[PDB]
C-alpha cells in the first residue's frame, strides 16, 4: 500500500534541476526505449517502461562522484529498487518486445524519464494496485 | 531493415554505456551462407579501415556511443544478415541486423500474331522483373546480371480475340497489372 | 498495305493488258526521302536479278500479268514507299505502293521512391516501345537500335499515395493499359 | 539442276490436277546426309512461312498449279537433294530435285627462286580453287571458309630452266591452263 | 583601470566549476574554434587571444534553459566578460581568426579550457593589472 | 589537411551555434579550376544523397554540430579544394578546406653503357615517380595514368668511371637517395 | 642491283684508297622521296650502331676497304635509292646505289556467267599481282597490304563462246600466260 | 663473351689456313638445353641463308678467313652457348663460343604507411630487376616478359622510424644502393 | 432516252453465260481494277461506277482470237456498251479510279462480276430507265 | 485396220472450237510433255506423246458439266480409249524418259494436243500399221 | 710519236711479274673500279679505257713501303705510264667512269688484270704504234 | 750450345725483305697469338710464342712455289725445326692458355713474327740456356 506515496516531489524536483543543468547540444545518443507506435495503453506502457528506465539510470546517467546530480541519480536508483515491489511480473517472452532503438538528444531522453516518473506517480496515487494489471495482450499486440 | 536497389542505407549498433565511444573496437561482418563471417571493416579510436573488397560499397562512422555501417549503394548481393562485434578489453557484445534489399518490380506486356498457318492466333506475353520474389499470372525463371529475377508467361488467343485481357504481376506485397486492349488491325 | 516486324510481306504490281507477262521489263525501287530511287531488283522473261544490297531481304517473282515484290522479313528500315516500273518497248508505267511496317507495342511499368529530401514521393514510370507512333499518357522520345521508338512518362505521387494509378499506352490504333496497384510498404 | 555460286535458282514442283493451286499444302525440305529431312518452309492458301534458319536464303511462291522453291543466293552448303511434299486432305505426292552448286575454278600460278645454297633452282606453284572437284597437274587438299576446295602442286626446275612450263587445272568438265614463260633475270 | 586586478572573483570560478560538475559525461564530440597552442605559446598573448574566443563561445555555445542556475551562471560570466573588455587593449583585426584552430572535443574538455582561461587570467591580473596592455602583433604574426 | 593515395580521409565543417545539427541543409562541392563548383552530395535531417558520379567514392555523415565529408579512398583527382555550404532558412555559411593527396615517391636507378662511338661512356639514370612535386638531381616530366608525375635525370660518366655516384630524389618534404656503386665489368 | 621479296641482299660502298678501312666514318641512309635522307646506321673502327627503326632489318659490316649494307630480308618498302657517306677527317665522299625489290608475279584466271538479262555472256577475269610493274592484257590498279600491286582485266564472250581464250600477264621482263579452255557446260 | 641487353654483338670463328674463305661451308648453331643443336644459318661462297625463326635477329658475314655471327640485338633468350661448324670437303672443324647477356639491374625503393590500426608503421619496399642473378637485402622471385628476373624485399618500421634506412641490390659483380631518408609528415 | 429500258436483251446475257461456261477451269490468278464493295454499297452508284470499269475490262482484258464466237460475243457487248453510254450521265472526273481496288482472282470470278453487272443493270433499267441519271458525287466522295 | 479412220475431222473441229473459245492470258501452268530436243523422230515422238495426251486430257482439261467443251473432252477421251488398240507396247523403262516439265500458257498446251491429233491422223491414214514400230532405240537415245 | 712502239720493255713486265709472285696468297677481297668486259669488248677501245684506270689504280692502290724494291717497281711503272700518256689521244670526258664497274676481288686478280693490260698494250703498240689514235666515242657510248 | 748462333741475320734480312714486298691493305685476317695483357714476362712470352710462330709459318705464310719468299719461308721453317732443341717442354695444360684471337692486317702479323725472331736471337746470344726456364707460373697467371 505504501506504493501510493513512494515517489515524492523531492525526486521530481531533483530530476528537473538535473534536466535544466544540462547543456543543450545537437549530439545524439543511442538507447532502447518503449515504441509508442506499438504500445499506446498508458498503464502497460509505463509498466514496460519501468524496467528500461532502471537500466538507463544504471548505465547511462553518469556523473562525477559526489556531485549533486550524482547523488540525485543515487536517490532515483534507490527509488527504483523500492518500486520493484509495486510491479508484478508478466512474461519473459515480451522483454525486448515493443522496444525500439532511439537516436536522440540527452535532453529528450531525460524528458522521457521525467514523464515516466510523473505519470507513474499520478497513477499510483489514484490506484496503488494499478500496476498489478496483466498486460500480456497489450505486449503481444506489438 | 529494408531498402530499395541503389539507395543509401544505414544499419546501427551501439555501446550500452553512454560514456564510451572511440574506445570500443568495432568490427562489422557479412554473414554468407553457412553462417560464414566475412570481415567488412574495422574501427577504433576513430581510425576506420574497410577491407579492399568492400571498399567504396561500405563505410563505417561514429557518433557518441552509436556506430553506423553505411552501404553507399545497395545491390542484390547485399541482402542478408550483418553482424556487429564491439569489444572493450576482454568483454565483447554482438548485435545482428537483417538487411532486405528490394528491386521494384517491372511488368511489361507485348504481343505478336502467328505467322503460320494463318494470322489469327494472337499471343500476348507478360513479363515481370523484380526481387526477391517475382510472380506473374494471366487472368484467363531467369536470373539477371543485376542479380534480380525475371519470370514470364504467355497466352494464346484464337480468333475472335476475347479482349481485353489482363495479367497480374507482383513482388510479395507489391502488385501491378498489365492489360492488352486492342490490336492494330483486327 | 501493312505488316508486322519480321513477317513475310508481298507488294504487287501488274500490266493492264492481260495478254502479256514475261515480255514486260519490271524493275522495283525503294523510295528514300526526297523521292529518291534505290534499285532493288529487275525481271524480264522470268530472268530475275536482285541487287546485292537487297539480296536475301527482297525477291521478285511473277504470275500471269501480276508482278510480286516479296520482302522475306520486314524490318523498320523497310517502312516507306516503293515504286514499280514496267516497260514494254517505248511505253512504260509507274505504279506506287506504301508499305507500313509495325512493331507491336511493348508497355512497361516500374516505380521508385524519392531518396531526397524524404522517402515519401513515389514516382511511377510508364514506358512504351513501339512503331511507328508510340504514345504514353497518365490518367487522372528515344530511338532504339532495332529502329523502333521508345517513349516514357513519369508521375509523382506524394503521401498518401492515391493508388491504384493507370497509364494508357498505344500505337496508333493498337492500345494497352498499365496499372500500379500497391507498393511494397 | 545446276547453278553457279551466288546465283538465284528455282526448283519446281506442281499438282497433277490443274484445277487446284492454293488448296494444296506444300512443304519443302533439305535432304541432309542419312536421308535426314530438314524443313525449309511451308505454304498453304498463299500463306508462306520459311523456318528462321533458312529465312532470307530460301523463299516459296506459287503460280497456278506450280510451286517454286527459290534459293535467293546459292552457296556450297546448298548442293544436295531437295524434296517437295504436296498434300490434299489424306492424299500426298512427293517430288525430288537435285541441285548441283558449282564454283568456277580459279587457277593461279606464281614462282620463287631458291635462297640456298644458290639461286639456280626455280620452283613454280600451280593452285586451283574450285567446287565440287578441283584437279591440278604439271605437264613435266584444303577446305576454304566459302565451303570450296583448294588444291595445289609444286614443280622444281634446276638451271638451265626448261621454260616454258605448263600446268593443267580443271573442275570436272571445266578446264583452264597456266604457263610460266620467263623469269625476271635468267 | 586598476580595478581590473579584482574584477574576477572566486564566486565566478565557483559557479563555473559547479556548472562543469553538473554536466553529464558522454562520448559525443562537438566542433568549436579556439587558440592553437602549437602556433601561440606566449602565456600573455595566448590569454589575450583566448579572451575574445571565450566571449563568442560563451555567447553562442554555452546555452541553457532560461532562468536555470547554470543559465544565470553564464549570464554572470557574460557580464564579467563585458566588464573585462576594458582591461584588454586592441591589437589588430587582421589577426582575429589567426592562431585559431578547429577543435572536435567533448563539452567537458571545452569547459575545462574556459575554466583554465579564467583561472590563469585571474592570477596574471592580480600580479599586474596592466599585463594585458601588451602589444602581441608579433606573437600573432608568427602564426601561419 | 593531408592524406596518402588510397587511404580513407575526412574533411570537416560545422555549424557555429551548437544547438543545431539535423536542421542544417548541408551540401558539399568539389572545386575544379576557376573556382567551379561540382555538387558531390547533400544532407538534411540525416537524409543523405550523394550524386551518382561520386557515389562510392564520397559519403556524408553527421555528429552533433559537425558535418563530415568522407573520401572512402583518395586518388590523385581528389587533390584540390572542397567547399561546404550550410544553410538555415535565409542564412547560409560557406567554409573552405584544402585536401592534399600524396603519392609516396618511388625512386629508381638504372644504368647503360654507350653503344657508339665506343663502350666507355656509362650513363646512369635516376627516376622518381611521386606526387604532387617530384624532384631528381645528381650530386657532385611525364604524367602517368594513375595521375601521378614521373621525372628522371641522366648522368654521363667517361672512363675512368668515378664511382660511386649518388642521386637525390624527393617529394617536397619526403626524401630518398640512390647510389650506383659498381658496374658488371 | 636487284633482289626478290624476302631474300637477303647486300649493297656495297668502298674507300678509294685501299690502305684505309676502320678509320673511315661510314653512314648509310634510306632515300625517301624528295631526296630525303633517313639515317639507317653508322660504323667507325668496327663499332656499328643501327638506328632502332631499322634494327633487325638492316646491318652494317666491313671487309678491308669495302663497306656492306645488308638487308636481312627485303620488303617492298625497301625498293628505292640508298646513300653511303664516308668521311675521313675533313674529306667526305657520297656513293649512290639503287635497290630494286621484285615480287614474283602471281597470275590468276577465273570466270563467271552473266545473271542478266540471260546466262549467255561468259566473262573471264585475268588477274596479276606483282611488283614493281604488273601488266595484264587479253589476246585476240589496287595496292595490297604487302605493298605489291594487283591489276586485273575482264573479257566478255557472247555465245557461241570462242574458246580457248588466252591472257598475257607480265612483270617487266618476267612473263606468264593464262588460258581458259572450257566451261562446265 | 659478354654483352648488355639490346646491344649488337659479334661472335667469331675462322679457318686455320688463311688461303681459304668462301670455299668453307660455315654453319652456326644455338645450343639449347640437353646439348640440342638448333640451326641458325648457313654460308657458302658468300651465299648466306638464315633460318626464318632467327631471321632479323641473327646474321652471318665474312672477311677473308674470318667468319662472323652477328646478333643484331641481344635478348635474354640468346644467353647460352653457340657452335660454329666449318667444313671443307670431308674435313670439318668445330668452334664453341659462350655469349653471356646481361640486363643492367634496376633498383627501386618506395614506401607506404599502415592504414590500420594506426598510421605509425611505415613499411619500405626495395625492388631489383636484373639478369642473370638479381639480389636484394635490407641492412637492418618473379619472371618478367622481357625474360629478366624481378625480386623484392619489404621492411616494417614501428614509430619512432629509425631512419635513414638502406637496402643493397646487386647483379653478381654489379651493385647499387637505395636509401629512404624521410617521410612526408613524421 | 426511253429506249435505255430495253437496250440490254437476254441474247447478250446468253452469249455472256455461254462464254463463261466455255472457259477452262484453272488455278491461275490475274490482276484487274474493279469497284470496292467495302467503300461503295449503294446499288445505283455501285453499278454506275462499275459500268466504265466494265468498258475498260471488256476492251483490254477479254481478248479472243479474231472472228471467234466468243470474240464476236465480246464485240456485241462492246457495241452494247457504246450504246449504253448515253444512258449514264457524267458525274466528275476526280472520282474515276476512286472507290476502285485491285483484284487478284480467277478469270471465271472476273467474268462472274461482269455477268452480275449486266444482269442487275438490266433489271434496274427496266424498272426505271432514268435511274442512272442519279448524282453520285456524295457516294463517290465517301470513299477514302 | 479401222485405226485408219478412227480419228475424224469432227474431232479436230470440236478441238479447234474448244481452242478458240479460250481466253488469252499470261498465266502459265505446269505439265509433263515430250522433249523435242531429245526425241525428234516423228513416229516415235507421237508414239510417246499419245500416253501423255491421255493423262493431260483426263486430269487437265476440265470444264463445267454438260458444257459443249466438257462433251468435247468426253468425245476425245473415248477416242483415246479406242486408239489404245492402235499403239503397241514398247518398254516400261522408257516411261518418264524423253519427258520434261513445261511451264506454258494453256493455249500452247492445247496447241500441242491439236498438233498431236492432226499429225497422228495423217500418219494413220498413210499407214494404219505405222505405230507398231519399235522405238526402244529412239527412246534410249534420250 | 713513233717511239711509242718500244716504250714498254720486258724489264717492266719482269718487275711486274716479280711483284705479283712476291705477294702472299689470302682470302681477303678488295674493291676497285675497272673496265666492264660485258659492255666493252673491242680490244683497242677496251685497252684505251683501261689505261687511265690503270694510272689511277697504280697511283692510289698499289702502295708499298718507301724505297722497297716493289715500291721502286711501281715508281718505274708510274713513270712509264706518264710517258705513255702521249701515245693515247683524248676522246671525251663524258665517257670517263662509263663502261666502268666495281670489282670485289683478290689483290692477285687485280694485279693479273694490270699485267694483262701492259702485255696486250705492248703487243698492239709493236704491231701499230698508232693503234691508240682510234676514236672510240661509239664503243664507249654503247655502254649503258 | 749451338743455339747461340742458330739464328742468323740472313734470316732476319730475308724476313724483312719479305715484309717490305707485301702490299699494304685494309683487309684483316684472323690468327691465334700471345696475349700481352696476360703475359708480360719477356722470356716466357717468347717461349710461348715460339710454337704459335711454328704453326703460323706452316699454315699461314703461303707463297707460289719456287718464289723467293716461298724459299724464305722454307728457310725459316727449317730454322724453326732446328730451334726445337733449344726450348724445353713446360706443360700441356697451358697450351691454348695466354692465347687470344687476333684480327689484324697481314703486315702486323709479319711484324709480330719479326719481333719474335729478333728478340729471340738477342736473348739466345746473351744466354743460350735462357729458354730452359720454367714458366709454369707465368703461364698459370693468365
Ligand atoms: C554488389 O556489391 C558487391 C560488394 O558487396 C560487389 O562485389 C565486389 O565487386 C568488385 C568488382 O567485381 C570486386 O572487386 C574486384 O576484385 C578483383 C580481384 O579479386 C579485381 O581484379 C577487380 O579489379 C575488382 O576490383 C570485389 O571483389 C567484390 N567484393 C565482394 C566482397 O564480393 C559487386 O560488384 C556488386 N554487384 C554489382 C552487380 O555491381
The answer to whether the CB atoms of F62 and B64 lie below 8 A apart is: no
b/e map of L84-111 (b: 16 or more CB within 10 Å)?
A: eebbeebeeebeeebbeebbebbbebbe
Q: Which secondary-structure segment (H or E) carries L12?
A: helix L9-20
> What's the rounded Cα separation, in Å, for the pair E70 and E58?
12
Q: What is the 3-state secondary structure (H, E, C) of chain A?
A: CHHHHCCCHHHHHHHHHHHHCCCCCCCCEEEEEECCCCCCCHHHHHHHHHHHHHHHHHHCCCCCCCCHHHHHHHHHHHHHHHHHHHCCCCCCCCCCCCEEEEEECHHHHHHHHHHHHHHHHHHHHHCCCHHHCCCHHHHHCC
C-alpha cell at F129: 615517380
Q: What is the 3-state secondary structure (H, E, C) of C83-94?
A: EEEEEECCEEEE
> What's the rounded Cα separation, in Å, for the pair G88 and E50?
85
Range of the domain at F37: 1-103
Q: Which secondary-structure segment (H or E) carries B52?
A: none
- State which ligand 1 atom lies nearest to the alpha carbon of B147: 38
| Burial environment of residue C162 by CB neighbours within 10 A (0 to 12, 13 to 18, 19 or more) | exposed
Residue pointed to by grid coordinates 678501312:
G21
Q: Give the residue from E26, E28, E30 with the most F CB atoms within 10 Å of its CB, the best one to mutate.
A: E30
- State which ligand 1 atom lies nearest to the alpha carbon of B75: 1
Indicate the angle between helix axes A42-59 and A106-126, nearest 10 degrees. Answer: 130
The DSSP string of chain D is -EEETT--EEEEEE-SSTT-STTSEEEEEEEETTTEEEEEEEEETTEEEE-TTTBTTEEEEEETTEEEEEESS--GGG-EEEEEEEEETTEEEEEEEEEEEEEEEEEEEEEEE--SS-S--EEEEEEEEEES-EEEEE---EE-TTS-EEEEEEEEEPSS----EEEEEEETTEEEEEEEEE-S--
**What chain D residue is nearest to G106 in terms of C-alpha separation?**
D110
> What's the rounded Cα separation, in Å, for the pair I114 and I132?
18
Query: Which whole-number Å values give the CA distances from E80 to D139, E2, E124, in the listed order?
Result: 126, 16, 16
Q: Phi and psi dihedrals of A118, rounded to 5?
A: -60, -60
C46/chain G closest Cα distance in angstroms: 10
Chain I residues near residue D20 by CB distance under 8 angstroms? 27
Chain A residues near residue B65 by CB distance under 8 angstroms? 29-30
Indicate the angle between helix axes L9-20 and L68-83, nearest 10 degrees. Answer: 140
By the CB < 8 Å criterion, does L71 face chain K?
Answer: no
> What's the rounded Cα separation, in Å, for the pair K137 and G141?
43
Query: Which whole-number Å values give the CA distances from D157 to D110, D180, G6, in the listed order?
Result: 14, 12, 20
Q: B109, B10 in Cβ contact below 8 A? A: no
Q: J141: number of CA atoms within 13 Å, CB side?
A: 14
State whether G171 and G91 are in the same domain: no
Q: Report CA Rg, chain H.
A: 24
Nearest 5 degrees, angle CA I8-CA I14-CA I16? 85
Ligand 1 neighbours (beta carbon < 6 A): B 53-54, 57, 75, 77-78
> What's the rounded Cα separation, in Å, for the pair A86 and I29?
105
Contacts of K97 (CB under 8 A, 6+ apart): K33
> What's the rounded Cα separation, in Å, for the pair K87 and F27?
109
State whether H110 and H64 are in the same domain: no
C-alpha cell at H24: 668453307
For chain B, the 3-state helix, strand and coil shares in percent, each to the nearest 5, are: 0, 65, 35
* Closest to D110 in 3D by CA, of G106, G179, G169, G132: G106
* Closest to C55 in 3D by CA, of G112, D73, G115: D73
Terminal Cα-to-Cα distance of chain L (whole angstroms): 31
Domain termination site, one of F80, F103, F126: F103
Ligand 1: residue whose CA is nearest its atom 20 = B53
Q: Which secondary-structure segment (H or E) carries L138?
A: helix L136-140
> What's the rounded Cα separation, in Å, for the pair C163 and C182?
7
By the CB < 8 Å criterion, does A76 face chain E?
Answer: no
Contacts of H48 (CB under 8 A, 6+ apart): G8, H41, H42, H59, H60, H61
- State which ligand 1 atom lies nearest to the alpha carbon of B78: 5
Residue pointed to by grid coordinates 517513349:
C151
State whether D84 and D20 are in the same domain: yes
State whether D140 and D171 are in the same domain: yes
Of F14, F17, F64, nearest to E60 by CB-CB distance is F17
> What's the rounded Cα separation, in Å, for the pair A104 and B14?
13
- State which ligand 1 atom lies nearest to the alpha carbon of B51: 31
Q: G120, G111 in Cβ contact below 8 A? A: no
The CATH number that applies at residue F1 is 2.60.40.10
CB atoms within 10 A of CB J12: 15
State whether B108 and B86 are in the same domain: no
CB atoms within 10 A of CB B61: 21
Distance B53 CA to ligand 1 centre (A): 6
**What chain I residue is nearest to D18 in terms of C-alpha separation?**
I26
Q: How far is CA L37 from the centre of its chain?
A: 18
Q: How many helices (H) and strands (E) does chain B have?
A: 0, 15
State whether C139 and C112 are in the same domain: yes
Contacts of G146 (CB under 8 A, 6+ apart): G75, G76, G103
The answer to whether the CB atoms of I30 and C17 lie below 8 A apart is: no
* Closest to D1 in 3D by CA, of D99, D117, D133: D99
Domain termination site, one of C73, C103, C133: C103
Question: Does C touch G (3+ CB pairs < 8 Å)?
Answer: yes
State whether F99 and F111 are in the same domain: no
Q: Which secondary-structure segment (H or E) carries G30?
A: strand G25-32
Nearest 5 degrees, angle CA G163-CA G165-CA G170? 170
State whether G133 and G175 are in the same domain: yes
C-alpha cell at I119: 444482269
Chain L residues near residue K70 by CB distance under 8 angstroms? 20-21, 23
For chain H, the 3-state helix, strand and coil shares in percent, each to the nearest 5, are: 0, 65, 35
- State which ligand 1 atom lies nearest to the alpha carbon of B76: 1
Contacts of K40 (CB under 8 A, 6+ apart): K46, K49, K99, K139, K140, K142, K143
Number of domains in chain D: 2
The answer to whether the CB atoms of D184 and G177 lie below 8 A apart is: no
Chain J residues near residue C15 by CB distance under 8 angstroms? 26
Beta bridge partners of C94: C85
Query: Which whole-number Å values give the CA distances from J91 to B83, J35, J48, K8, in the listed order?
Result: 97, 18, 11, 110
Number of domains in chain A: 1
**What chain F residue is nearest to E105 in terms of C-alpha separation?**
F66
Scan residues 85-114 of D and list those with Cβ closer than 8 Å to G: 102, 104-113
> What's the rounded Cα separation, in Å, for the pair J106 and D66?
13
Method: X-ray
C-alpha cell at C9: 510481306
Range of the domain at E19: 1-143
Size of chain B in residues? 186
Contacts of L33 (CB under 8 A, 6+ apart): L49, L52, L56, L99, L100, L102, L109, L112
Residue pointed to by grid coordinates 526481387:
B131
Q: Give the residue from G117, G174, G185 with the most D CB atoms within 10 Å of its CB, the best one to mutate.
A: G174
Domain termination site, one of H103, H128, H152: H103
Q: C139, C167 in Cβ contact below 8 A? A: yes
> What's the rounded Cα separation, in Å, for the pair E35 and E49?
7
State whether C5 and C75 are in the same domain: yes
State whether G8 and G91 are in the same domain: yes
Ligand 1: residue whose CA is nearest its atom 24 = B53
State whether C82 and C108 are in the same domain: no
Beta bridge partners of G99: G80
> What's the rounded Cα separation, in Å, for the pair F55 and D118?
72
Distance B57 CA to ligand 1 centre (A): 9
Q: ω into residue G160 within 30 of 0, thus cis?
A: yes
The answer to whether the CB atoms of H184 and F178 lie below 8 A apart is: no
The DSSP string of I39-90 is T---HHHHHHHHHHHHHHHHHHT----TT-HHHHHHHHHHHHHHHHGGGS--
> What's the rounded Cα separation, in Å, for the pair A9 and A25?
28
The answer to whether the CB atoms of A28 and F20 lie below 8 A apart is: no
> What's the rounded Cα separation, in Å, for the pair F29 and F33?
13
Q: Which secondary-structure segment (H or E) carries B60?
A: strand B58-63
State whether D71 and D109 are in the same domain: no
The CATH number that applies at residue L37 is 1.20.1250.10
Question: Does F touch C (3+ CB pairs < 8 Å)?
Answer: yes
Q: C166, C179 in Cβ contact below 8 A? A: yes
Beta carbon pairs, A and E, within 8 Å: 57
Question: Does B touch J (3+ CB pairs < 8 Å)?
Answer: no
Q: What is the dihedral of CA H14, H17, H21, H22, to 10 degrees?
A: -120
Mutating to test ligand 1, I would choose from B28, B53, B70, B71 the residue with most ligand atoms within 8 A of its C-beta, which is B53
Q: ω into residue B164 within 30 of 0, thus cis?
A: yes
Long-range residue pairs from H161-167, CB within 8 A, at least 24 positions apart, any chain: H161/H122, H161/H186, H164/F177, H165/H124, H165/H138, H165/H139, H166/H138, H166/H139, H167/H107, H167/H109, H167/H124, H167/H126, H167/H136, H167/H137, H167/H138, H167/H139
Amino acid at each position: 500500500e505504501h506504493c501510493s506515496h513512494m515517489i515524492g516531489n523531492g525526486h521530481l524536483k531533483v530530476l528537473q534541476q538535473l534536466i535544466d543543468s544540462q547543456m543543450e547540444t545537437s549530439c545524439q545518443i543511442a538507447f532502447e526505449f518503449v515504441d509508442q507506435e506499438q504500445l499506446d495503453d498508458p498503464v502497460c506502457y509505463l509498466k514496460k517502461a519501468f524496467f528500461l528506465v532502471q537500466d538507463i539510470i544504471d548505465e547511462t546517467m553518469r556523473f562525477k562522484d559526489n556531485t549533486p546530480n550524482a547523488n540525485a541519480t543515487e536517490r532515483l536508483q534507490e527509488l527504483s529498487n523500492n518500486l520493484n515491489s509495486c510491479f508484478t511480473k508478466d512474461y519473459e517472452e515480451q522483454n525486448k518486445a515493443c522496444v525500439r532503438t532511439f537516436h536522440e538528444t540527452p535532453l529528450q531522453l531525460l524528458e522521457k524519464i521525467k514523464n515516466f516518473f510523473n505519470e507513474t506517480k499520478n497513477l499510483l496515487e489514484k490506484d496503488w494496485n494499478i500496476f498489478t494489471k496483466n498486460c500480456n495482450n497489450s505486449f503481444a499486440k506489438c | 531493415v529494408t531498402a530499395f536497389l541503389g539507395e543509401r542505407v544505414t544499419l546501427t549498433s551501439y555501446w550500452r554505456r553512454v560514456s564510451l565511444g572511440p574506445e570500443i573496437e568495432v568490427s562489422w561482418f557479412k554473414l554468407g551462407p553457412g553462417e560464414e563471417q566475412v570481415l567488412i571493416g574495422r574501427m577504433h579510436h576513430d581510425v576506420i579501415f574497410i577491407e579492399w573488397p568492400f571498399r567504396g560499397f561500405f563505410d563505417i562512422h561514429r557518433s557518441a556511443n552509436t556506430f553506423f555501417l553505411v552501404v553507399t549503394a545497395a545491390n542484390i548481393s547485399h541482402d542478408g544478415n550483418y553482424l556487429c562485434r564491439m569489444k572493450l578489453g576482454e568483454t565483447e557484445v554482438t548485435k545482428q541486423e537483417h538487411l532486405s534489399v528490394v528491386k521494384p518490380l517491372t511488368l511489361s506486356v507485348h504481343s505478336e500474331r502467328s505467322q503460320f498457318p494463318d494470322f489469327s492466333v494472337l499471343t500476348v506475353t507478360c513479363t515481370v522483373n523484380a526481387f526477391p520474389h517475382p510472380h506473374v499470372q494471366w487472368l484467363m525463371v531467369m536470373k539477371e546480371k543485376d542479380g534480380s529475377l525475371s519470370v514470364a508467361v504467355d497466352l494464346s488467343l484464337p480468333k475472335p480475340w476475347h479482349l481485353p485481357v489482363t495479367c497480374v504481376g507482383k513482388n510479395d506485397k507489391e502488385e501491378a497489372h498489365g492489360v492488352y486492349v486492342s490490336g492494330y488491325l483486327s
